Structure formats: structure tokens, C-alpha cells
Design a protein around this ligand. Structure first.
Ligand SMILES: Nc1nc2c(ncn2[C@H]2C[C@H](O)[C@@H](CO[P@@](=O)([SeH])OP(=O)(O)OP(=O)(O)O)O2)c(=O)[nH]1
Ligand SMILES: Nc1nc2c(ncn2[C@H]2C[C@H](O)[C@@H](CO[P@@](=O)([SeH])OP(=O)(O)OP(=O)(O)O)O2)c(=O)[nH]1
Ligand SMILES: [Mn+2]
Ligand SMILES: [Mn+2]
Ligand SMILES: [Mn+2]
Ligand SMILES: [Mn+2]
Lengths: 170, 176
DNA sequence: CTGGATCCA
DNA sequence: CTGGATCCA
């Protein structure tokens, strides 16, 4: 376990130091998610989402992730979930990395921000409008629903739900 | 697990044909041997097998929640590695030796598709499926599908399925 | 080629 | 609710 402040600190050390095979990952594209983003006093792990600017790269980003400076082991890894165990200040913490292509970023932030309870209510509701929501996009009947949106707040509003901040979602 | 000869596998099966059963809210229910079908390397009559693969035909959709989850082999000592409604992998003690026993299930209307799938070998299944992929079809242990939709075929048996799909019917021992 | 059990996210 | 990684069938 870690405190919110520990998580926040850890993130910052990482914001500069992410990269992949030798290509750096802009901090602009790293987004803290999960219990950290919701600003819980206590966290179990740090959950980071990474925005990939093009579809080809997913085969390479998490599979060839590079944290310049840090000691760590990889539990499991694929193109969309890589779970790392980092040695931080003589202690071991879990670091979960996820990816989203550019056009997915809001859908993903919304999904990975959580909490789960909130996601279930939201998702349950959308089934009866024939819609399907997830981390990738919004879909009607096995088809992508193109929304003229950039951010999470815009996604949440456009979907037709009340925009609440992460700390006040459950 | 450990290796067995075709004859060992065949023998094992027979001991099992009469001894399979299941609980279903506390009624202890036997599984007809008529509904047990040897599959995998045994059915292909390879000289040597790695495990015995048995397919079980379930006559009613409700029962799947109960059959493999509450499987009963009357007489045998065994441990369960993993188990769900469709794959249950068992390790049986047979004659002071441990062998793997993989149980699968198919509903009635699935039986040919399942037999075909589980009969294998894998290499053969890939060629076959690749070809059907190119006509915009999808083959499964469950059925045949075009564009996420079931393709109803006038068929009963595996040979009829294989033929109807539009492939040359070869017997299990000569598939690869 | 295609999917199942497990155990996560 | 909805889907991912792994190790299998
Ligand atoms: N749809 C869906 N999404 C899920 C689920 N579990 C986690 N997630 C997402 C939402 C979470 O904010 C995010 C991180 O998951 P996690 O297991 Se790490 O829980 P989290 O909310 O961060 O709290 P903490 O890590 O336990 O402190 O992943 C889930 O079961 N269903
Ligand atoms: N489509 C598809 N089917 C597969 C696959 N692996 C096993 N199967 C099916 C076909 C096999 O006949 C059956 C059992 O597989 P298994 O790994 Se246990 O080997 P099997 O072919 O029985 O011979 P043996 O067990 O090695 O002696 O399950 C697969 O990857 N794709
Ligand atoms: Mn977390
Ligand atoms: Mn996590
Ligand atoms: Mn086998
Ligand atoms: Mn097997």
C-alpha cells in the first residue's frame, strides 16, 4: 500500500522517464488513473494510462517499455496491460500500465478512472439504449459511434450523463 | 501427466464409459456411455497418447452448469486441475501411475461441430478454418457462422458436416 | 484458427 | 459492466 502523496511522487519520477524500443514517451501522454486520480487517502498500486499517437505502435510500447533509472520486474505484459513491480526506496510496489490509441483517450480515462461500482451503474444503463460503452469507444450494434469530442468531460456530457469529478464518483 | 499407448487409452475409456455421472442439486445422475465420445490423439489412433480426451454430449442447455462442475467417476481416484462448464481437466491415478484426462461438453445440436473440433489434429483444423475464413465464414466447436450469425445446416453427423462444409471427408487416423 | 478457465484490470 | 494475459484445449 501507498499514500496518495507517495503515488503522486512516484508518478512524477516516471513522467520524465518512460520510453520504448529508443523513443521517449511524452509526459503529456501519461495519465494517472485509478484510486490515485480519485484521490483516495490510501492506494494499492499506481495505475498509469499511456496515450499512443498511432495504431502500429501498440505492438511495441508496453512490450518494449523503458523506465530510465528505475529497478523493476514485469509480472505480465501485452499490448494493452503491462503490470510492473518496481523497487522504490527499499520497498516493492505494483505499477499497472495501460494503453489507449489517440482516438480512444477519453473513453479509456473514463474506464480506468473508475471506481468499478460507478462503471457498473453507467454501463448497465447504456445496454437498454442499444449502446455499448467500454475503454475503446462507444458502439451501437457492433459499430463505432463517432462523437465530435476531445476530453473526458466532453465524453461524459455527450453520452448524456452528469459530469462528476473523479473524487466524487462511486 | 504421462504418456500412454493407444491400447491403454482405449482400456481407460472403457472403465470410464460405465462410471461417469453428476450431481444436480442433490440427484446423483449417470451419464450414458452412448453420450461419451473419445476424441483427440486416441480417436486419431496415434500409437502414443499424452492424455485421454473425452467429449460428453449433454441433452439439455440447463445442465451445463452442473455436469463438469459436479462430475463423478464412480471407482476412480483423481484430482481436478481446472474446471468449468466446458473444459474439465482431471489427473487420474490409474494402476500406480498418473495420467491426464480432459473432459469437454457439447449440447445435442453441437455434436458434429464439437467432434470435428476435438478430433483434431490442430494443424488440420487451421487449414480448414483459414479456408472458410476467406469465404467470410467462421467454424467453431459450437457451430458454423457467417457475419456473427448461425448458419443452419441440414446435417446430423460429422461426416455430413465435413462434406456439407465442402471439404473432402478423411477418417481421423488420416487427418493432418 | 478458435475458444475456455483462471485471475485479474 | 466489460474486457486483457496467460496457459492452455
Ligand atoms: N469495467 C471494469 N473496470 C475495472 C474493473 N476493475 C478495475 N477496473 C478499472 C477501474 C479502476 O479505476 C482501474 C484500476 O483498477 P484497480 O483494480 Se487497480 O482498482 P483501483 O480503483 O485503482 O483502487 P486500488 O488500486 O485498489 O487502490 O481499472 C472491473 O472489474 N471492471
Ligand atoms: N482449433 C484448435 N483445436 C485445438 C487446439 N489445441 C487442441 N485442440 C483440440 C484438437 C485436439 O484434437 C484436442 C486435444 O488437444 P491436445 O492439446 Se490434448 O492434443 P491431442 O491432439 O489430443 O493429442 P495428444 O493429447 O497430444 O496426445 O483439442 C488448438 O490450438 N486449436
Ligand atoms: Mn489502483
Ligand atoms: Mn491496478
Ligand atoms: Mn489429447
Ligand atoms: Mn487433452
Amino acid at each position: 500500500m501507498l499514500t496518495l502523496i507517495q503515488g503522486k511522487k512516484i508518478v512524477n519520477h516516471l513522467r520524465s522517464r518512460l520510453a520504448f524500443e529508443l523513443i521517449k514517451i511524452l509526459s503529456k501522454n501519461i495519465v494517472a488513473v485509478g484510486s490515485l486520480r480519485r484521490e483516495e487517502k490510501m492506494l494499492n498500486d499506481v495505475d498509469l494510462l499511456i496515450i499512443v499517437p498511432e495504431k502500429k505502435l501498440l505492438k511495441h510500447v508496453l512490450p518494449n517499455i523503458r523506465i530510465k533509472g528505475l529497478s523493476f520486474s514485469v509480472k505480465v505484459c501485452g499490448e494493452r496491460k503491462c503490470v510492473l513491480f518496481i523497487e522504490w526506496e527499499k520497498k516493492t510496489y505494483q505499477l499497472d500500465l495501460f494503453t489507449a490509441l489517440a482516438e480512444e483517450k477519453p473513453y479509456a480515462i473514463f474506464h480506468f478512472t473508475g471506481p468499478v461500482s460507478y462503471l457498473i451503474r453507467i454501463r448497465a444503463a447504456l445496454k437498454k439504449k442499444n449502446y455499448k460503452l467500454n475503454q475503446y469507444g462507444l458502439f451501437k450494434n457492433q459499430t463505432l459511434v463517432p462523437l465530435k469530442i476531445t476530453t473526458e468531460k466532453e465524453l461524459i456530457k455527450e453520452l448524456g450523463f452528469t459530469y462528476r469529478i473523479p473524487k466524487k464518483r462511486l
